[PDB]
Coordinates of C-alpha atoms and ligand atoms in Angstrom, one line a residue:
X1 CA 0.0 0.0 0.0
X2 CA 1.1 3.6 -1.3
X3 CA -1.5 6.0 -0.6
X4 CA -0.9 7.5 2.7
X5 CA 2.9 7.8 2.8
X6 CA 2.6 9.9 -1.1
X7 CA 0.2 12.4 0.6
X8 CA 2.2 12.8 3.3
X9 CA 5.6 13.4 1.0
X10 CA 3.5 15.6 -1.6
X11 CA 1.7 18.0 0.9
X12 CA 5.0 18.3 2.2
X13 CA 6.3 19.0 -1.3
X14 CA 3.6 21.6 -2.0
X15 CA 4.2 23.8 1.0
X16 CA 7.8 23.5 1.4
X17 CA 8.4 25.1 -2.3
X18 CA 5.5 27.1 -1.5
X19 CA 7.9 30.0 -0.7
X20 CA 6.9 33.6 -2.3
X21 CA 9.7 35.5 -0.9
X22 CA 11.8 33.3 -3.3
X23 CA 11.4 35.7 -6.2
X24 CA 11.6 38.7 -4.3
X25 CA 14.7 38.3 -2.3
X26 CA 16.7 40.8 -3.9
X27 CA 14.4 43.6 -3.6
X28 CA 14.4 42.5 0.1
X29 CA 17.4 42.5 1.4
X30 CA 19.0 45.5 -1.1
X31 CA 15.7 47.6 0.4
X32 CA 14.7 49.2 3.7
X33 CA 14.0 45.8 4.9
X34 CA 17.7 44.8 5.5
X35 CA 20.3 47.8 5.1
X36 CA 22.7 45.4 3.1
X37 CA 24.5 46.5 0.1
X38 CA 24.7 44.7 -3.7
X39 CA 28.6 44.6 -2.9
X40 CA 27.7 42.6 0.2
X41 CA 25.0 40.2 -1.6
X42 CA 26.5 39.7 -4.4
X43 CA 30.5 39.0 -2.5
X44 CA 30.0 38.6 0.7
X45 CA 27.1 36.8 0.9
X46 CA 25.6 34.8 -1.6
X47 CA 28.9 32.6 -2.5
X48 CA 28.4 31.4 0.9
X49 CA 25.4 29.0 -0.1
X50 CA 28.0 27.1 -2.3
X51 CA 30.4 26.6 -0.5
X52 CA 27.6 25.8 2.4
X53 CA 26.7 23.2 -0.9
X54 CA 30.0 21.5 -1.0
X55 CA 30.9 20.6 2.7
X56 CA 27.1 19.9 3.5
X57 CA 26.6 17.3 0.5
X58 CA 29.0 14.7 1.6
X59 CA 28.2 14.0 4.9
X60 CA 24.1 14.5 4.5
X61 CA 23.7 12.0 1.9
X62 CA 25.5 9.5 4.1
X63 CA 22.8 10.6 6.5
X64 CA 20.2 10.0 3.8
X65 CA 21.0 6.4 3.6
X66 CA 21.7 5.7 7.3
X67 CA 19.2 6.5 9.0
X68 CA 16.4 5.9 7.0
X69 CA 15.5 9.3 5.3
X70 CA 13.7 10.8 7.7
X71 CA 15.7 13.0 9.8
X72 CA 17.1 14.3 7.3
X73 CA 13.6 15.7 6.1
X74 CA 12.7 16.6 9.5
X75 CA 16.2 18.4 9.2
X76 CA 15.2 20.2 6.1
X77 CA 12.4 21.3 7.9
X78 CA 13.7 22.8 10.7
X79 CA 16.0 24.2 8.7
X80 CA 13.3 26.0 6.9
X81 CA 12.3 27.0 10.0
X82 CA 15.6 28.5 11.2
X83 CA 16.9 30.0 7.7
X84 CA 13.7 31.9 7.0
X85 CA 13.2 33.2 10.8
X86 CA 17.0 34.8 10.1
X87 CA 15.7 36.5 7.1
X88 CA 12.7 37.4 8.8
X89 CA 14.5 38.8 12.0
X90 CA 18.7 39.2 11.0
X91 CA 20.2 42.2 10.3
X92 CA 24.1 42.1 9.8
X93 CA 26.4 40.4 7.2
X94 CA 27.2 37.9 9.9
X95 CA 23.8 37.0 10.3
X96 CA 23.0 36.5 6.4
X97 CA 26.0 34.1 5.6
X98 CA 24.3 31.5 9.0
X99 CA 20.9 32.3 6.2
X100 CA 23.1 30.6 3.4
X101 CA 25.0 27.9 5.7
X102 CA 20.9 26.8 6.6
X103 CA 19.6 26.9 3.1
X104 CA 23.0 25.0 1.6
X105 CA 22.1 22.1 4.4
X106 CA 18.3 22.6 2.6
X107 CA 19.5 22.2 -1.0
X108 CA 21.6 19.6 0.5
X109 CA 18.5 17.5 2.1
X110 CA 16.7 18.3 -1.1
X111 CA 18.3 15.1 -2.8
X112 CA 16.7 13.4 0.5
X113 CA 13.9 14.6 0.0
X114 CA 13.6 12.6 -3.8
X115 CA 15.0 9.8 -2.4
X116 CA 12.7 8.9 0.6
X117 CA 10.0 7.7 -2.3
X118 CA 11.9 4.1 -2.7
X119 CA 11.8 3.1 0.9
X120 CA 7.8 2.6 1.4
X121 CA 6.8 2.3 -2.1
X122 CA 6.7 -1.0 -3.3
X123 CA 9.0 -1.1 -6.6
X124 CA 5.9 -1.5 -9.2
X125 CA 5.3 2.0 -8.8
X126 CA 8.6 3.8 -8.5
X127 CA 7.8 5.5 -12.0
X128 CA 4.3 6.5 -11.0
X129 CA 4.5 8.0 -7.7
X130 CA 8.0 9.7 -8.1
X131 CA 6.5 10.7 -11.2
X132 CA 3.8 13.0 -9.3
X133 CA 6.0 14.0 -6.5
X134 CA 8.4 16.4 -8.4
X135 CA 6.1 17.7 -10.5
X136 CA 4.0 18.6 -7.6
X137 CA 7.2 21.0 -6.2
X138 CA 6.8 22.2 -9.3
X139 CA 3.4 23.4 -8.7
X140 CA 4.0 24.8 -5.5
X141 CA 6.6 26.7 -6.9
X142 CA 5.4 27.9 -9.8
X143 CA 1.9 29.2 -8.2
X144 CA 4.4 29.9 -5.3
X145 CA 5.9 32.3 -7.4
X146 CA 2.5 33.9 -8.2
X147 CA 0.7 34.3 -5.0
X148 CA 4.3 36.4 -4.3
X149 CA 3.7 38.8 -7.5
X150 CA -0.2 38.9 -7.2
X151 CA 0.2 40.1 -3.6
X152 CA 2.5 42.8 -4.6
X153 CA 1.2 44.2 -7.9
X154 CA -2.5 43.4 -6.6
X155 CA -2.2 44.8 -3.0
X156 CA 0.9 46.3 -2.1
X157 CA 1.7 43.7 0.5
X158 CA 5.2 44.3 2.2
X159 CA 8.0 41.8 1.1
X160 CA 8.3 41.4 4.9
X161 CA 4.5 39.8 5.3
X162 CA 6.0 37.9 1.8
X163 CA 8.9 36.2 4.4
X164 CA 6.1 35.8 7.1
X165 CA 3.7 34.1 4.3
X166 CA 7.0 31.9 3.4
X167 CA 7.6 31.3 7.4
X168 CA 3.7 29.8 7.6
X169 CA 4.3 27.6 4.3
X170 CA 7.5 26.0 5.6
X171 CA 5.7 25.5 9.5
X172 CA 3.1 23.9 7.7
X173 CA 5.7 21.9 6.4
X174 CA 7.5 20.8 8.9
X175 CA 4.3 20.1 10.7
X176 CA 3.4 17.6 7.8
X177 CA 7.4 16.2 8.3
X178 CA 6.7 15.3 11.8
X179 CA 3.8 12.8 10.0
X180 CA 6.1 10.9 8.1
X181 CA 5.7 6.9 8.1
X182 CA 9.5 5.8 9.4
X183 CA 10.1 3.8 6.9
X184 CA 12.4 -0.3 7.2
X185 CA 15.0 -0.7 4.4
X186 CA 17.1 2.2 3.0
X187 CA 19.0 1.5 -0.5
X188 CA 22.3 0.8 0.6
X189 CA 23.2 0.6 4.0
X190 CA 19.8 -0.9 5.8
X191 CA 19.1 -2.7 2.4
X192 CA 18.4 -6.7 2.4
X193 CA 21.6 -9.2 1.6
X194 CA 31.9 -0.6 -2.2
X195 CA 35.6 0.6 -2.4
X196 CA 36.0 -2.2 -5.2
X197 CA 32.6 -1.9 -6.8
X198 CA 33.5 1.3 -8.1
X199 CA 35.0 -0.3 -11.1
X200 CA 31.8 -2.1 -11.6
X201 CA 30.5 1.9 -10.9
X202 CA 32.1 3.2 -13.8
X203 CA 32.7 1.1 -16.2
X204 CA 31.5 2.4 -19.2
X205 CA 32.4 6.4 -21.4
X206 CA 29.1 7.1 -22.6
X207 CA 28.1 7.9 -18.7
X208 CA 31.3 9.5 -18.4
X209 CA 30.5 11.9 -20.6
X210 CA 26.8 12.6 -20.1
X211 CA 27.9 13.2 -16.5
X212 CA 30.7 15.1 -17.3
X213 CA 28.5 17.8 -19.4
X214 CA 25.7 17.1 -16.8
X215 CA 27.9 18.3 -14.3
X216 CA 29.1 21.4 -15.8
X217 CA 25.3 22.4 -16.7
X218 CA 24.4 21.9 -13.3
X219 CA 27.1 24.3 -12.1
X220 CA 26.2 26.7 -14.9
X221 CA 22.8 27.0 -14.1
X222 CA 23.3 27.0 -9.8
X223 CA 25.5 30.1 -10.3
X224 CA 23.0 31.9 -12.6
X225 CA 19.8 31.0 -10.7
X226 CA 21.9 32.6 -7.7
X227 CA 22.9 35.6 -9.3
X228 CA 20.4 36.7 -12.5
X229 CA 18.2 38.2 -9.5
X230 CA 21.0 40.8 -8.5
X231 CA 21.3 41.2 -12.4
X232 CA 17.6 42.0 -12.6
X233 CA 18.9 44.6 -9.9
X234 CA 21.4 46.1 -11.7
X235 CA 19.4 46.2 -14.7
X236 CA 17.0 48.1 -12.7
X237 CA 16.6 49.0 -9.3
X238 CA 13.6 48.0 -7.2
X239 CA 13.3 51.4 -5.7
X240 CA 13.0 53.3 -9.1
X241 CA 10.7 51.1 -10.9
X242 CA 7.6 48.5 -10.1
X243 CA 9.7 45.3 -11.1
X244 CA 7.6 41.8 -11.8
X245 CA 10.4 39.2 -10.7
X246 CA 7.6 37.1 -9.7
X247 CA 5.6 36.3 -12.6
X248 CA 8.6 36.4 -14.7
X249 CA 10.5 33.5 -12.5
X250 CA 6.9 31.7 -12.3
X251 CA 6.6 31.7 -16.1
X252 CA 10.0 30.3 -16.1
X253 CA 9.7 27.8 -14.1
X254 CA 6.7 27.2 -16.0
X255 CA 8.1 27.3 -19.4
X256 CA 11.0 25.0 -18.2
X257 CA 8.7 22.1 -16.4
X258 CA 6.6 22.6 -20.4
X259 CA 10.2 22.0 -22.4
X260 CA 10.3 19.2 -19.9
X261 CA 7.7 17.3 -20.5
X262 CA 8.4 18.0 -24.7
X263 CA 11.6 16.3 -24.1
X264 CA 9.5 13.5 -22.6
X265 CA 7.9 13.0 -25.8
X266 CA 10.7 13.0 -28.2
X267 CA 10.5 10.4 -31.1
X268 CA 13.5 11.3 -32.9
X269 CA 16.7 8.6 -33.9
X270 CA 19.0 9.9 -31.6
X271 CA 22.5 9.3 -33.1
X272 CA 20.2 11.7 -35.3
X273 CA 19.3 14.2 -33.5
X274 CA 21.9 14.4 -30.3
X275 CA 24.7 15.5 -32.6
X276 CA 22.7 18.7 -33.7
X277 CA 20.1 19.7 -31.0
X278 CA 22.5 19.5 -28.4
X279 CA 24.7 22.2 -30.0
X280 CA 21.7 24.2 -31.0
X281 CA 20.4 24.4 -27.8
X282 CA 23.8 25.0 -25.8
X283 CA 24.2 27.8 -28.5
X284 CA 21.1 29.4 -27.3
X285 CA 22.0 28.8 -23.5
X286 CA 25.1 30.6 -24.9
X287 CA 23.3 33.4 -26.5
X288 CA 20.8 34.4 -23.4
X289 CA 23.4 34.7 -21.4
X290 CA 24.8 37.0 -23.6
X291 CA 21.5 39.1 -24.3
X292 CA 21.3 38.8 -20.3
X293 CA 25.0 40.7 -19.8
X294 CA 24.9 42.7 -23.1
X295 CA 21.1 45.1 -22.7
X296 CA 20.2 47.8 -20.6
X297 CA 16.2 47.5 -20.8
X298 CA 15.1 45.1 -17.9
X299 CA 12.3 43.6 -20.5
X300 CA 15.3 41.9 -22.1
X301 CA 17.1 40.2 -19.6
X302 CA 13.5 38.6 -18.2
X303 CA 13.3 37.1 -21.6
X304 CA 16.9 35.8 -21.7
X305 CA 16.3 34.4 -18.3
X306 CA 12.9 33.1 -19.3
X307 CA 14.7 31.5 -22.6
X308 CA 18.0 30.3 -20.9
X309 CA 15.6 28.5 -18.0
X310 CA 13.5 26.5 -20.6
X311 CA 16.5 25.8 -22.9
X312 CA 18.4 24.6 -20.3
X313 CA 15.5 22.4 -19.0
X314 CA 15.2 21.1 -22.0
X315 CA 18.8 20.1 -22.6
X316 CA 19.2 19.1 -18.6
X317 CA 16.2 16.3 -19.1
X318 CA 17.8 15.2 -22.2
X319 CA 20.9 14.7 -19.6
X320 CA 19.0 12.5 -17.1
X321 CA 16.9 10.3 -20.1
X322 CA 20.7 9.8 -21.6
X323 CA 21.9 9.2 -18.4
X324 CA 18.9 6.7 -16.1
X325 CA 18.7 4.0 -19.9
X326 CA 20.7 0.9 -18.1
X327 CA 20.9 2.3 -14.2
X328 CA 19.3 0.1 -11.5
X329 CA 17.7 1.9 -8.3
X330 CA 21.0 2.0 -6.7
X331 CA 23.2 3.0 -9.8
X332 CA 20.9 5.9 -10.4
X333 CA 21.3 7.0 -7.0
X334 CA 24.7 6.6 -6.5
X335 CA 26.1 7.7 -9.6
X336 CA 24.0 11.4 -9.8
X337 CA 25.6 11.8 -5.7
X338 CA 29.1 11.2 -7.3
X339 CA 28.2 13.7 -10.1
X340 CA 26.7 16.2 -8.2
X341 CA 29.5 16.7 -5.7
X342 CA 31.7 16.8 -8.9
X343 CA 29.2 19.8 -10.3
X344 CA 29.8 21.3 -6.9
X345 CA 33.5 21.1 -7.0
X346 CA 33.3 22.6 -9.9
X347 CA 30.7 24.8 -9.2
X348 CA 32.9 26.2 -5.8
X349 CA 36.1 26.7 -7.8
X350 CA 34.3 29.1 -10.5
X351 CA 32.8 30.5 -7.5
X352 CA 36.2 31.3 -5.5
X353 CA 37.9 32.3 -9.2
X354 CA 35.2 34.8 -10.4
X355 CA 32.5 35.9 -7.7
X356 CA 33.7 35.7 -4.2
X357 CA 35.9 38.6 -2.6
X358 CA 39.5 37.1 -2.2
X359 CA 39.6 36.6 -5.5
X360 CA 38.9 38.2 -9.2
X361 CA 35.9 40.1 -7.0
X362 CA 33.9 41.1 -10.1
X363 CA 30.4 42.5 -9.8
X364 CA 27.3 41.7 -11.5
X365 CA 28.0 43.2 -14.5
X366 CA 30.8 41.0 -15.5
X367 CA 29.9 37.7 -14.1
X368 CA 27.0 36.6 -16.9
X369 CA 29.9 37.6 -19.9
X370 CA 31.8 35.1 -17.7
X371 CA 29.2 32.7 -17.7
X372 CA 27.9 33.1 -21.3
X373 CA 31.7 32.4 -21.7
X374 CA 31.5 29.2 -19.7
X375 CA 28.4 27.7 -21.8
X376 CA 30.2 28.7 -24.9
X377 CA 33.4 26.6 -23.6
X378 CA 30.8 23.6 -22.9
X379 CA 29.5 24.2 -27.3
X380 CA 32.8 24.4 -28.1
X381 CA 33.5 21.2 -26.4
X382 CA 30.7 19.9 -28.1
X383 CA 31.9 21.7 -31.5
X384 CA 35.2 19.7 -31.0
X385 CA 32.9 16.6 -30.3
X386 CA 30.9 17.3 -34.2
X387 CA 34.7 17.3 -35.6
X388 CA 34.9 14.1 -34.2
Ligands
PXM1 C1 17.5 31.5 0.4 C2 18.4 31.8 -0.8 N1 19.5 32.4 -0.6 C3 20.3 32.8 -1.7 C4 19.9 32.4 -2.9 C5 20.9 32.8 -4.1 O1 20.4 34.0 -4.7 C6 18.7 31.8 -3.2 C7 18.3 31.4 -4.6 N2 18.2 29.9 -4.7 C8 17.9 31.4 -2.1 O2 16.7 30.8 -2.3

């Protein structure tokens, strides 16, 4: 039996992404609600959440495994708890770096979170129930996103009561976390009768690659969806002018979850197709980056964010149907954890190179021509790839 443990998982799904101050965090903490400079956000700050990625991924996922995937939700949830009562109520720069410490250790249990699905479902319907789970974080997203930008074009409601609407979503949360069924076997550690196995892990090239590009696009795409809000500040301050970061982040996430489901439906001969689209698409990843460092009217850099979102949605699902074709339940598992603290490694180098303050310390401004520059590395990877 299924039933009650999905509820359970997907109602806690729906209101922990059920977070409006998401879009509007920029305008928050560069306004009168925080006295906190861009400098500070964008330096000081912000870089903090991947580095609090890195050193937080290792040890959590051998808590996911251990014991039994639980606390490690129940973890998530009181770290929504903690990180958005220190947005609500910290002021300070040492205050906002504990903000991203807490919210790295929540992208961290994130992977827990997709994970506790194979413990009390039976595996007949691993496909089915997984399959409504994500989407539904999706949907409280999405609509997430919306309820933030309809309460502030619509009523003039304070990002502040935007944090405390957040704070109720993720109590609700962890209120539903403290119903979870505990569940009896984990994947590897409690499962029923790997230093050498890791031959047997990797012994193939064609998920070497896939997880090698998978794992640049992953740290790509964490360092813009960090930073294209302080861009969208730049661009244009919130102060000046009545800016819609809500319903242009909703109808991205929107657009990407669509080019999703397209990929899911994709009857083309892939030796075909993977040779071309794959270029095409990293060449217009390439190319909205590029409109996003290159105009001056804020109009434009929605739509390259809106148009670098779907496209890389697109090319990121083509990713994990390449990668999940021959991958048992533990494979899967084991082999994205591997991959993603490679994306993270990678990910915190580029961070400590080009954003962070001991280092290049560039601003805003120069940081998506660096990163345009870094998908245009990945196609010409892929351009040396189509000579071969
Ligand atoms: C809480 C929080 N902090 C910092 C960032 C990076 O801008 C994000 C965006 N994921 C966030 O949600």
């Amino acid at each position: 039996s299924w039933i009650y443990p999905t509820v359970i998982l997907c109602l806690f799904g729906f209101f922990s992404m059920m977070r409006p101050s998401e879009p509007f965090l920029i305008p928050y903490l560069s306004g009168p609600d925080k006295n906190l400079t861009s400098a500070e956000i964008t330096n000081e700050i912000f870089p903090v959440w991947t580095y609090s990625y890195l050193v937080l991924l290792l040890p959590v996922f051998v808590l996911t495994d251990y014991v039994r995937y639980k606390p490690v939700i129940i973890l998530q949830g009181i770290s929504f708890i903690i990180t958005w009562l220190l947005l609500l109520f910290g002021q300070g720069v040492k205050t906002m770096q504990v903000v991203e410490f807490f919210y790295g250790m929540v992208t961290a249990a994130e992977v827990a979170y997709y994970a506790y699905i194979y413990s009390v479902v039976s595996p007949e319907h691993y496909q089915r129930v997984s399959g409504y789970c994500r989407s539904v974080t999706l949907a409280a997203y999405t609509a997430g996103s919306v309820l933030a930008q309809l309460l502030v074009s619509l009523a003039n409601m304070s990002y502040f009561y935007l944090n405390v609407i957040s704070l109720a979503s993720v109590s609700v949360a962890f209120l539903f976390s403290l119903f979870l069924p505990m569940p009896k076997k984990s994947m590897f550690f409690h499962a029923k009768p790997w230093f050498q196995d890791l031959k047997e892990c990797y012994s193939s090239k064609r998920l070497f690659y896939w997880s090698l590009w998978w794992a640049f696009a992953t740290a790509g795409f964490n360092q813009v969806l960090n930073y294209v809000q302080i861009l969208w500040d730049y661009k244009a301050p919130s102060q000046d002018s009545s800016i819609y970061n809500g319903a242009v982040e909703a109808i991205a996430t929107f657009g990407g979850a669509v080019a999703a489901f397209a990929v899911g439906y994709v009857k083309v001969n892939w030796d075909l197709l993977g040779e071309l689209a794959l270029v095409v698409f990293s060449v217009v990843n390439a190319g909205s980056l590029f409109l996003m460092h290159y105009t001056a009217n804020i109009w434009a850099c929605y739509a390259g964010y809106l148009i670098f979102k779907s496209s890389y949605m697109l090319l990121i699902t083509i990713a994990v149907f390449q990668i999940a074709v021959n991958l048992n339940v533990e494979r899967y598992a084991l082999v994205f954890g591997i991959n993603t603290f490679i994306a993270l490694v990678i990910q915190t180098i580029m961070t400590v190179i080009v954003v962070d303050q001991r280092g290049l310390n560039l601003p805003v401004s120069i940081q998506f021509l660096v990163y345009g520059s870094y998908f245009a590395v990945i196609a010409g990877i892929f351009l040396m790839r189509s000579m071969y």
